[PDB]
Amino acid sequence: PQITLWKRPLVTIKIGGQLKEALLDTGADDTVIEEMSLPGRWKPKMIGGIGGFIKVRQYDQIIIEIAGHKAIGTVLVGPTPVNIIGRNLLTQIGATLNF
Amino acid sequence: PQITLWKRPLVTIKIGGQLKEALLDTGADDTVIEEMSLPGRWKPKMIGGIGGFIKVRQYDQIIIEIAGHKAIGTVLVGPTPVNIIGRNLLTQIGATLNF
Numbered sequence: 443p444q445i446t447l448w449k450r451p452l453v454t455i456k457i458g459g460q461l462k463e464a465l466l467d468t469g470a471d472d473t474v475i476e477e478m479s480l481p482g483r484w485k486p487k488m489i490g491g492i493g494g495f496i497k498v499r500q501y502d503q504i505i506i507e508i509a510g511h512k513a514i515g516t517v518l519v520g521p522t523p524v525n526i527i528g529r530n531l532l533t534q535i536g537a538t539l540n541f
Numbered sequence: 542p543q544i545t546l547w548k549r550p551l552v553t554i555k556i557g558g559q560l561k562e563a564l565l566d567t568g569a570d571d572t573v574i575e576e577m578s579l580p581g582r583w584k585p586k587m588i589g590g591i592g593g594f595i596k597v598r599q600y601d602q603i604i605i606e607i608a609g610h611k612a613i614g615t616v617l618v619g620p621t622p623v624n625i626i627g628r629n630l631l632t633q634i635g636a637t638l639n640f
């Protein structure tokens with residue numbers, strides 16, 4: 443699609459068989475999702491957002507569908523105000539910015 | 542242009558007579574610039590991202606030039622770690638997300 447920005451670019455994602463809503467976020471290096479269970483081991487990660495730094499759980503090689511496009515990559519889990527799809531997975535679905 | 546997302550989508554902006562680098566950020570509702578003075582009236586606001594909230598000054602009707610394209614709208618000024626061009630000005634330069 444071509445998504446304009448007059449409203450938030452929210453899409454449906456599917457992770458662990460569950461549908462969720464997430465924000466396509468070109469200002470995020472990383473994908474960050476609200477507390478949920480994911481398989482496998484996780485590693486520690488700190489991310490610095492507008493308000494300061496938080497701890498998250500980094501799960502690698504997670505299968506996630508984004509607006510009907512399949513991706514497999516790193517998902518950070520932690521107390522983000524909104525689920526966000528960052529550039530690590532926007533590149534996997536072929537997204538670009540255009541003007 | 543078409544901007545891929547392998548790297549942060551940074552562009553040069555001109556605001557308040559100053560040249561700065563800023564992130565084209567589809568996950569930001571509004572534009573947030575590091576501390577600087579701007580002319581005119583402002584009012585305080587709180588915005589809440591990863592890491593929590595910061596207090597900013599809201600200036601309305603500010604003209605920016607974004608990668609050579611002029612736009613006018615609200616700019617929030619405050620202790621953001623990165624300058625951000627959010628949706629309120631991305632719409633004005635006709636930016637879309639495409640995949």
Ligand SMILES: COc1ccc2c(c1)COC/C=C/CCCCN(C[C@@H](O)[C@H](Cc1ccccc1)NC(=O)O[C@H]1CO[C@H]3OCC[C@H]31)S2(=O)=O
Pocket residue numbers: 467468469470471472473474489490491492522523524526528566567568569570571572573588589590591621622623625627
């Ligand atoms: C009202 O106008 C607003 C304007 C901006 C924001 C909000 C409201 C707050 O809007 C509420 C939404 C919050 C959820 C997502 C955060 C949205 N935000 C934009 C988002 O793109 C930030 C932009 C940024 C970039 C660098 C540093 C600070 C901030 N990126 C970010 O947090 O990414 C994290 C995950 O990947 C990592 O890579 C970059 C840092 C880290 S925000 O800054 O909190």
Ligand SMILES: [Cl-]
Pocket residue numbers: 477478479
């Ligand atoms: Cl869960």
Ligand SMILES: [Cl-]
Pocket residue numbers: 514515516530531
């Ligand atoms: Cl990844």
Ligand SMILES: [Cl-]
Pocket residue numbers: 576577578
């Ligand atoms: Cl200044």
Ligand SMILES: [Cl-]
Pocket residue numbers: 613614615629630
């Ligand atoms: Cl505006």
Ligand SMILES: [Cl-]
Pocket residue numbers: 446635
């Ligand atoms: Cl339009």
Ligand code: NA
Pocket residue numbers: 580581582600601602603
């Ligand atoms: Na003003």
